[PDB]
Amino acid sequence: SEALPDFTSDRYKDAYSRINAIVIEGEQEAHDNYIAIGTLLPDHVEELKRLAKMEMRHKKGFTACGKNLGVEADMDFAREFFAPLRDNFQTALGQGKTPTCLLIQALLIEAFAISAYHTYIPVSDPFARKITEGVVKDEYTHLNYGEAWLKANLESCREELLEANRENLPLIRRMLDQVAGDAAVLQMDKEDLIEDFLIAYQESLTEIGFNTREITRMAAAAL
Numbered sequence: 001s002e003a004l005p006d007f008t009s010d011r012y013k014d015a016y017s018r019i020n021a022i023v024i025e026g027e028q029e030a031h032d033n034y035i036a037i038g039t040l041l042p043d044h045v046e047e048l049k050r051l052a053k054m055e056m057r058h059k060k061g062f063t064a065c066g067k068n069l070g071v072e073a074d075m076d077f078a079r080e081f082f083a084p085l086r087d088n089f090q091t092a093l094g095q096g097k098t099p100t101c102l103l104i105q106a107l108l109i110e111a112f113a114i115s116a117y118h119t120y121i122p123v124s125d126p127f128a129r130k131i132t133e134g135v136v137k138d139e140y141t142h143l144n145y146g147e148a149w150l151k152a153n154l155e156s157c158r159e160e161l162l163e164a165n166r167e168n169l170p171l172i173r174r175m176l177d178q179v180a181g182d183a184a185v186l187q188m189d190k191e192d193l194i195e196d197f198l199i200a201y202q203e204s205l206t207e208i209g210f211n212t213r214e215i216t217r218m219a220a221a222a223l
């Protein structure tokens with residue numbers, strides 16, 4: 001209780017202006033990514049549209065969280081934060097590389113979100129806590145969607161996935177490093193963020209059909 005941040009302080013609002021922007025930007029990117037995957041999987045378009053609509057609801061919810069605290073979201077900072085990963089997604093999209101697009105959005109980004117949201121909930125203000133608790137359940141759904149498709153297609157895309165992991169897992173690690181200072185002002189421990197991210201991602205890779213040697217090797221790419 002004494003560990004809860006002072007949500008009204010200038011220090012908190014400053015850090016929140018960047019963290020809030022990143023979440024808003026991320027939800028919008030998630031929407032765009034699922035719609036984009038629909039161009040690669042035309043028979044999945046209705047399901048992907050449903051996922052994308054959920055992302056827009058998350059975006060509006062988190063936008064409201066910033067407004068509730070009297071915070072103005074630093075959207076330029078957020079756009080720059082996502083740019084490297086965004087670039088890799090767009091490159092894969094342009095090459096028709098569906099498994100790479102799904103690993104980036106449905107596995108890496110969803111796991112990062114899940115981890116972040118779980119870590120934020122216990123230290124969040126009462127308004128944002130309700131919103132975030134609602135969102136987390138949806139992200140499980142998104143993770144499961146990506147897991148299911150990759151699991152069904154693993155034998156044809158194994159090597160591409162290893163490559164996508166090698167290229168993109170370090171970007172998530174760099175993002176975690178970049179967000180850590182502001183996250184700490186929000187009373188979130190970077191070690192919790194890293195642990196819960198790796199656990200979520202490891203569990204998804206297990207579901208997809210990777211063995212321990214493979215997953216240890218993949219986790220090691222973050223170095």
Ligand SMILES: CCCCCCCCCCCCCCCC(=O)O
Pocket residue numbers: 019020022023026027030055058062105109110112113116117120132139142179183
């Ligand atoms: C609401 C504040 C939570 C704490 C935020 C800590 C920084 C992590 C930001 C990652 C958000 C990624 C958004 C992806 C959303 C999705 O894929 O549905």
Ligand SMILES: [Fe+3]
Pocket residue numbers: 027030054055058113135139
């Ligand atoms: Fe979302």
Ligand SMILES: [Fe+3]
Pocket residue numbers: 030055110113138139142
């Ligand atoms: Fe999502």
